[PDB]
Design a protein around this motif. Structure first.
Motif, PDB file in Angstrom:
ATOM      1  N   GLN B  26      -6.304  48.579   2.876  1.00  8.78           N
ATOM      2  CA  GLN B  26      -7.387  47.622   3.081  1.00  8.78           C
ATOM      3  C   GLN B  26      -7.771  46.944   1.772  1.00  8.78           C
ATOM      4  OE1 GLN B  26      -8.376  47.818   6.429  1.00  8.78           O
ATOM      5  NE2 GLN B  26      -9.907  46.176   6.476  1.00  8.78           N
ATOM      6  N   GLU B  27      -7.760  47.700   0.669  1.00 15.36           N
ATOM      7  CA  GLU B  27      -8.091  47.144  -0.639  1.00 15.36           C
ATOM      8  C   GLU B  27      -7.116  46.057  -1.067  1.00 15.36           C
ATOM      9  OE1 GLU B  27      -7.369  50.176   0.152  1.00 15.36           O
ATOM     10  OE2 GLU B  27      -8.960  51.588  -0.390  1.00 15.36           O
ATOM     11  N   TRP B  28      -5.934  45.999  -0.452  1.00 11.92           N
ATOM     12  CA  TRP B  28      -4.977  44.944  -0.748  1.00 11.92           C
ATOM     13  C   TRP B  28      -5.309  43.637  -0.040  1.00 11.92           C
ATOM     14  CZ3 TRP B  28       0.086  48.205   0.319  1.00 11.92           C
ATOM     15  CH2 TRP B  28       0.168  49.217  -0.645  1.00 11.92           C
ATOM     16  N   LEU B  29      -6.065  43.702   1.063  1.00 11.21           N
ATOM     17  CA  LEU B  29      -6.190  42.563   1.970  1.00 11.21           C
ATOM     18  C   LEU B  29      -6.561  41.284   1.234  1.00 11.21           C
ATOM     19  CD1 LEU B  29      -7.811  43.860   5.268  1.00 11.21           C
ATOM     20  CD2 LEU B  29      -5.439  43.227   4.773  1.00 11.21           C
ATOM     21  N   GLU B  30      -7.571  41.357   0.362  1.00 12.51           N
ATOM     22  CA  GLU B  30      -8.006  40.174  -0.374  1.00 12.51           C
ATOM     23  C   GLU B  30      -6.823  39.470  -1.027  1.00 12.51           C
ATOM     24  OE1 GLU B  30     -11.187  40.938  -3.092  1.00 12.51           O
ATOM     25  OE2 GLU B  30     -11.508  38.818  -3.564  1.00 12.51           O
ATOM     26  N   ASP B  31      -6.045  40.205  -1.828  1.00 12.76           N
ATOM     27  CA  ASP B  31      -4.874  39.613  -2.472  1.00 12.76           C
ATOM     28  C   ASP B  31      -3.957  38.964  -1.443  1.00 12.76           C
ATOM     29  OD1 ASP B  31      -5.420  40.228  -5.223  1.00 12.76           O
ATOM     30  OD2 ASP B  31      -4.850  42.312  -4.836  1.00 12.76           O
ATOM     31  N   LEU B  32      -3.692  39.668  -0.338  1.00 13.91           N
ATOM     32  CA  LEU B  32      -2.864  39.104   0.722  1.00 13.91           C
ATOM     33  C   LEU B  32      -3.426  37.771   1.199  1.00 13.91           C
ATOM     34  CD1 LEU B  32      -1.825  42.182   2.888  1.00 13.91           C
ATOM     35  CD2 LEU B  32      -0.409  40.813   1.351  1.00 13.91           C
ATOM     36  N   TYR B  33      -4.739  37.719   1.441  1.00 15.12           N
ATOM     37  CA  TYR B  33      -5.352  36.470   1.877  1.00 15.12           C
ATOM     38  C   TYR B  33      -5.144  35.371   0.843  1.00 15.12           C
ATOM     39  CZ  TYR B  33      -7.704  38.353   6.022  1.00 15.12           C
ATOM     40  OH  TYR B  33      -7.979  38.887   7.260  1.00 15.12           O
ATOM     41  N   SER B  34      -5.198  35.725  -0.445  1.00 15.69           N
ATOM     42  CA  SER B  34      -4.980  34.727  -1.486  1.00 15.69           C
ATOM     43  C   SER B  34      -3.577  34.143  -1.406  1.00 15.69           C
ATOM     44  CB  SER B  34      -5.223  35.341  -2.864  1.00 15.69           C
ATOM     45  OG  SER B  34      -4.220  36.292  -3.182  1.00 15.69           O
ATOM     46  N   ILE B  35      -2.598  34.944  -0.972  1.00 20.43           N
ATOM     47  CA  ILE B  35      -1.237  34.441  -0.818  1.00 20.43           C
ATOM     48  C   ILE B  35      -1.212  33.269   0.151  1.00 20.43           C
ATOM     49  CG2 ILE B  35       1.123  35.068  -0.177  1.00 20.43           C
ATOM     50  CD1 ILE B  35       0.558  37.893  -0.989  1.00 20.43           C
ATOM     51  N   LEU B  36      -2.142  33.247   1.112  1.00 12.35           N
ATOM     52  CA  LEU B  36      -2.184  32.164   2.086  1.00 12.35           C
ATOM     53  C   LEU B  36      -2.507  30.819   1.448  1.00 12.35           C
ATOM     54  CD1 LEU B  36      -4.122  33.982   4.945  1.00 12.35           C
ATOM     55  CD2 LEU B  36      -1.652  33.645   4.735  1.00 12.35           C
ATOM     56  N   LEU B  37      -3.081  30.814   0.246  1.00 11.41           N
ATOM     57  CA  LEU B  37      -3.473  29.575  -0.410  1.00 11.41           C
ATOM     58  C   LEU B  37      -2.476  29.107  -1.461  1.00 11.41           C
ATOM     59  CD1 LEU B  37      -7.337  30.007  -0.813  1.00 11.41           C
ATOM     60  CD2 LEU B  37      -6.002  29.017   1.059  1.00 11.41           C
ATOM     61  N   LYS B  38      -1.455  29.905  -1.766  1.00  9.35           N
ATOM     62  CA  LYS B  38      -0.471  29.517  -2.762  1.00  9.35           C
ATOM     63  C   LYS B  38       0.368  28.343  -2.261  1.00  9.35           C
ATOM     64  CE  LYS B  38       0.095  33.600  -5.630  1.00  9.35           C
ATOM     65  NZ  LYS B  38      -0.605  32.873  -6.723  1.00  9.35           N
ATOM     66  N   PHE B 118      -6.197  22.085  10.933  1.00  8.22           N
ATOM     67  CA  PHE B 118      -5.741  22.356   9.577  1.00  8.22           C
ATOM     68  C   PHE B 118      -4.518  23.258   9.626  1.00  8.22           C
ATOM     69  CE2 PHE B 118      -6.817  26.780   8.559  1.00  8.22           C
ATOM     70  CZ  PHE B 118      -7.543  27.118   9.684  1.00  8.22           C
ATOM     71  N   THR B 119      -3.846  23.354   8.483  1.00  6.51           N
ATOM     72  CA  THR B 119      -2.718  24.253   8.307  1.00  6.51           C
ATOM     73  C   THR B 119      -2.796  24.881   6.925  1.00  6.51           C
ATOM     74  OG1 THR B 119      -0.314  24.471   8.250  1.00  6.51           O
ATOM     75  CG2 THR B 119      -1.260  22.402   7.466  1.00  6.51           C
ATOM     76  N   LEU B 120      -2.151  26.033   6.781  1.00  6.61           N
ATOM     77  CA  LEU B 120      -2.076  26.709   5.495  1.00  6.61           C
ATOM     78  C   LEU B 120      -0.826  26.343   4.706  1.00  6.61           C
ATOM     79  CD1 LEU B 120      -3.331  30.271   6.529  1.00  6.61           C
ATOM     80  CD2 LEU B 120      -4.572  28.556   5.189  1.00  6.61           C
ATOM     81  N   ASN B 121       0.075  25.546   5.277  1.00  4.91           N
ATOM     82  CA  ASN B 121       1.291  25.133   4.590  1.00  4.91           C
ATOM     83  C   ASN B 121       1.044  23.820   3.860  1.00  4.91           C
ATOM     84  OD1 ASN B 121       2.932  26.428   7.440  1.00  4.91           O
ATOM     85  ND2 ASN B 121       3.085  27.326   5.387  1.00  4.91           N
ATOM     86  N   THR B 122       1.386  23.788   2.569  1.00  4.94           N
ATOM     87  CA  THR B 122       1.097  22.627   1.735  1.00  4.94           C
ATOM     88  C   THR B 122       2.066  21.471   1.955  1.00  4.94           C
ATOM     89  OG1 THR B 122       2.387  23.561  -0.092  1.00  4.94           O
ATOM     90  CG2 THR B 122       0.029  24.051  -0.032  1.00  4.94           C
ATOM     91  N   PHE B 123       3.252  21.731   2.498  1.00  7.10           N
ATOM     92  CA  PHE B 123       4.247  20.681   2.686  1.00  7.10           C
ATOM     93  C   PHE B 123       4.047  19.884   3.971  1.00  7.10           C
ATOM     94  CE2 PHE B 123       6.792  22.596   6.030  1.00  7.10           C
ATOM     95  CZ  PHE B 123       6.494  23.937   5.920  1.00  7.10           C
TER      96      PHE B 123
END
Lengths: 76, 496
Positions: B26-38, B118-123
């Motif tokens: 669970q402590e990883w979740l935040e980092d995982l969510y941040s991956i969605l914005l890369k 909206f979408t999380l994909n930048t392309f």
């Protein structure tokens, strides 16, 4: 019969590749003399400068058991 | 932590592997969510994003409102809609000659929203998604499992937004662009995309198959999906007859969007699944009739189930026709009076004559006043039923059999002031009146002969069921042969 591609412990992360299994050791053991053992057989013994140790995979064994079998032993 | 370390080293394949194994702290979740914005710089990041989202949606113990709103900068309503609304996965192929990674059958995950798209994909271009939003009148969140160029995904995303059931989206892929007013626009590389989709064991829907989103919605969410079953005596006229039936279906206002190829593609059917061939049938052979009726049962059950894609059996309309009246009687007995259907009569045009789409159980009802048939009754224990509704008159041979087989009773039924042979028209009342006469004069054991069209006999079989102990005789040429199957045998129980 397990399709799990990766597992984690306190010391390393096991990743399942195409024809290998990769042990990604935690960065805390970097530049330190360690001894990585699979069961009671030595797979590494020296200064760990690369956190990745690759071992062959033959029978698609349960990654949890394999992680239970691998162990990291620093010296000092 | 392990996730911070792996992300620092850009080990996105290992992160995706951990996410797919559902082994995530669970402590990883935040980092995982941040991956969605890369930024989607390579396919590893996009696939990791896709698997992270799918894990958040399937194992909702990782779905966190605080991270959805604070980390993803989502407003409260959109975040809660992502939490509550179910998602759909659609398949779409892309072929790039320059890069083989872009040539693939990709997946798109779609969650309907209320007032944001909206979408999380930048392309992905935002206006391309806004076009889908305008065409479907639905806001949505969409994510992709591969990096690609173009807007060939618009048809697949529109299908995912329109389809009420997710089963049909598992075997069907889509390619093509969509206009603002709901027009499907042609796309390039149809052949390579079809090759890719069939390599992945799925059917591909191209812009040449359907014209607009309304036609697509007819196939995705049908209120009365029309399937076809025609029994024929001439095998080399199979496909032609099918085409005729297709045309006969297109004459109906409710099925103006119907196309045989579209049905075969959408619901994974072949031509052989919609017709039955009997080259030379012997109506005195019990085993041959058993085999023919079991084949009929199998084909009708397949047409009504469609490999589990169809949930409601009443949401499928069986357009049914036959070529032999005696066989049509048993076809109707097996079909029952619960399945929505349309019985046709072939007079070189496959004219619709009986319609049971809306209310199927309304043939069993009787009439208090006879308006289309004339009956000559003599109620005794062994009843001889004779039906005269064709050019050939079977009354003489009928009475000859009556006294030849030692049948005491007599019950002749024929048309009223139509001079024997019947014209094309609505035939539901005729069948209902014949069933009324048969049920009101039912006896312990009775025999039946008939010279009538296939549709009348089929509807009469649907009305009778397997409750009446009637023995049927087939008239080949001036002579009758007993069918060794009683109409009340357990083998003829209707499962529909």
């Amino acid at each position: 019969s397990t399709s799990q591609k990766a597992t984690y412990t306190d010391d390393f992360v096991l990743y399942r590749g195409d024809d290998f299994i990769e042990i990604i050791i935690d960065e805390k053991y970097l530049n330190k003399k360690v001894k990585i053992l699979l069961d009671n057989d030595t797979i590494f013994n020296g200064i760990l400068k690369d956190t990745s140790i690759f071992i062959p995979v033959k029978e698609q064994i349960d990654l949890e058991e394999l992680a239970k079998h691998i162990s990291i032993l620093p010296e000092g | 932590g392990h996730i911070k370390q792996l992300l620092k080293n850009k080990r996105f394949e290992v992160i995706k592997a951990l996410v797919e194994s559902k082994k995530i702290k669970q402590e990883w979740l935040e980092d995982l969510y941040s991956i969605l914005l890369k930024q989607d710089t390579d396919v590893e990041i996009t696939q990791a994003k896709y698997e992270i989202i799918k894990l958040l949606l399937t194992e909702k113990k990782y779905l966190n409102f605080e991270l959805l709103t604070k980390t993803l900068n989502l407003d409260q309503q959109t975040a809660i809609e992502i939490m509550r609304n179910p998602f759909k996965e659609v398949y779409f192929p892309t072929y790039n000659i320059e890069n083989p990674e872009e040539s693939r059958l990709n997946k798109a995950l779609i969650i309907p929203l209320s007032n944001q798209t909206f979408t999380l994909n930048t392309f992905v271009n935002s206006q391309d998604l806004e076009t889908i939003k305008e065409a479907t009148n639905k806001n949505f969140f969409v994510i992709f499992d591969n990096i690609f160029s173009g807007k060939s995904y618009q048809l697949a995303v529109a299908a995912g937004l329109i389809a009420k059931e997710k089963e049909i989206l598992d075997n069907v892929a889509f390619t093509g662009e969509v206009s603002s007013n709901g027009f499907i626009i042609p796309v390039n590389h149809l052949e390579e995309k079809k090759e890719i989709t069939e390599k992945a064991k799925k059917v591909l829907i191209t812009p040449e198959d359907i014209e607009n989103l309304e036609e697509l919605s007819f196939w995705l969410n049908p209120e009365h999906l029309p399937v076809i079953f025609i029994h024929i005596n001439k095998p080399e006229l199979a496909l032609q007859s099918l085409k005729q039936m297709e045309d006969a279906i297109k004459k109906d206002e409710r099925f103006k969007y119907f196309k045989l190829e579209n049905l075969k593609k959408f619901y994974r059917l072949e031509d052989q699944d919609m017709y039955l061939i009997t080259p030379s049938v012997d109506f005195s052979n019990r085993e041959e009739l058993i085999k023919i009726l079991n084949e009929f049962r199998e084909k009708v059950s397949k047409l009504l189930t469609l490999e589990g894609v169809i949930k409601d059996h009443n949401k499928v309309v069986l357009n049914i026709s036959a070529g032999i009246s005696t066989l049509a009687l048993y076809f109707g007995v097996i079909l029952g009076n619960r399945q929505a259907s349309i019985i046709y009569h072939y007079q070189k045009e496959y004219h619709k004559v009986i319609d049971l789409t809306d209310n199927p159980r309304k043939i069993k009802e009787k009439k208090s006043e006879f308006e289309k048939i004339s009956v000559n009754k003599n109620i005794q224990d062994p009843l001889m039923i004779i039906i005269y509704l064709a050019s050939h008159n079977p009354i003489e041979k009928g009475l000859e059999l009556k006294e030849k087989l030692r049948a005491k009773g007599e019950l002749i039924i024929q048309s009223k002031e139509h001079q024997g042979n019947l014209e094309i028209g609505d035939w539901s009342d005729i069948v209902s009146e014949i069933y009324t006469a048969i049920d009101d004069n039912k006896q312990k054991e009775n025999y039946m002969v008939f010279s009538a069209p296939v549709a009348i006999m089929l509807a009469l079989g649907m009305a009778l069921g397997y409750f009446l102990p009637i023995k049927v005789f087939h008239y080949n040429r001036d002579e009758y042969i007993e069918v060794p199957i009683k109409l009340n045998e357990e083998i003829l129980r209707s499962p529909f």
